[PDB]
Design a protein around this ligand. Structure first.
Ligand SMILES: Cc1cc(C)nc(N)c1
Ligand SMILES: Cc1cc(C)nc(N)c1
Lengths: 269, 268
């Protein structure tokens, strides 16, 4: 992988592995989300971020600040097959004092066709108190160094799906998968649950018949609170809809505290 | 990746990913086991095996046969760090009518030093009845095409750890993690639980204090029965000692054994 000629974005190619694919011999959406995180991490290393797993700037380290994910939104047109090469381009943008955004475009390396796109929103937090805060002038100045100054959006459309508000699922849920818990493979190098694990847990409550007859086209996931290593999670889903749409909720098994909410859109094969 | 000049082994290089590492910023043993399976799959594709997820020969397809893992044994001297390149070389061998073996050597691509080695034993099974069987002459002939005919072993030594018999853990276990269940990410393309998931489940009952103060040097895992997508597993561990443990995975309900194993850990 490498920064592009202008140094404002980063590209990397991945060969899809045997264990990364599902029943149709194409990459799962969790494999896609892991590749998006990996290229994001390689881009951060290439522009001087800390190499301790927290991806912080110099000002952030001085002030004990970290970024936390607020939303992930992925749209896939074609999942790459086992052995195929996918090229992913990523870049960041500051959104004033609100937070920052990381965007991605996925392409078939042989054809050059766009096969998917993604966007994520991040908010600043004090690492010690876990309290949110606005982005300071010093941090916005650091982002100006390696971000395009004119807007560059993976989702340019007017009132596009990636910014839509998600409602809270009402009990009783139509479907559920109870008692989910992370194992060590679900943790990152800093012993926090990996963001991709929550996508897997959301999908656990989709019936196997939908997975067998449909392809996932869009997933939008809000993150509200982290699941700790000793927490247990319930995954709830209700149909809201040739397309099938669902509303999702992840909450702690032991008090019902919400940790995530989301929606998925599926197309019949 | 590519077959070597003589066409009897296969080599592939991997760059260790951010999400593949643990707290010491080095690859976990589950990341190593996934890379061993990936290079094994690329080698099978390169020598003409099925591309449907079952890695079968032509004679195996005609007779509705598949290979099932009986044992995995891994010894790591150094885990590669995040961003490092590891080169893995793999090859297979027939073991008469008993079954087949796949062996691996891991190297640091920059230094060329051996950083680990692994070996696995596979037995033939009818895909429909799930009954074991011996390897036929036609299948042994197919393996002669792409396997070295003189013995080539990752663990050559007579009576070495990789062939040691593993006893059955006695109740009560010292440690346990109960109620483990696979999610879709734990399944392979044929909807069977991935072999690497069982290594993760074994390690779940090792106390976090051992993981924080020691490095895993050796893991030996016997596979006896498959965990199905709707099964629930309990992971049991007892210290037998370096720190050494005895492991058992069994179904949560009826207590049916699915795996047994041992691990050896060295203090950091
Ligand atoms: C958006 C958000 C807010 C808070 C308090 N915690 C998160 N993990 C994410
Ligand atoms: C060694 C072995 C034996 C049987 C009956 N099933 C397995 N999955 C593995």
């Amino acid at each position: 992988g490498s920064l592009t000629e202008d140094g404002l974005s980063y590209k990397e190619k991945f060969v899809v592995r045997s264990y990364e694919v599902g029943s149709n011999k194409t990459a799962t959406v969790e494999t896609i989300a892991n590749l998006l995180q990996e290229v994001g991490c390689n881009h951060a290393q290439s522009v001087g971020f800390s190499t301790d797993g927290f991806a912080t700037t110099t000002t952030m380290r001085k002030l004990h600040l970290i970024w936390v994910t607020a939303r992930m939104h992925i749209e896939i047109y074609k999942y790459p097959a086992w052995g195929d090469v996918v090229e992913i381009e990523t870049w960041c943008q500051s959104e004033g004092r609100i937070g920052t955004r990381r965007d991605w475009i996925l392409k078939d390396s042989v054809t050059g066709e766009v096969t998917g796109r993604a966007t994520s929103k991040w908010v600043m937090m004090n690492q010690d108190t876990r309290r949110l805060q606005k982005v300071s002038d010093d941090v916005r100045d650091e982002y100006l160094v390696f971000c395009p100054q004119e807007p560059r959006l993976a989702f340019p459309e007017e009132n596009n799906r990636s910014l839509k508000k998600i409602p809270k699922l009402e009990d009783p849920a139509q479907y559920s998968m109870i008692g989910l818990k992370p194992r060590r493979a679900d943790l990152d190098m800093n012993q926090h649950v990996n963001n991709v694990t929550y996508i897997g847990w959301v999908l656990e409550s989709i019936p196997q018949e939908i997975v067998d007859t449909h392809e996932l086209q869009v997933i939008t996931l809000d993150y509200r609170r982290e699941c700790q290593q000793d927490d247990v999670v319930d995954s709830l889903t209700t149909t809201t809809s040739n397309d099938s749409q669902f509303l999702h909720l992840l909450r702690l098994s032991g008090d019902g505290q919400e940790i995530n909410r989301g929606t998925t859109l599926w197309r019949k094969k």
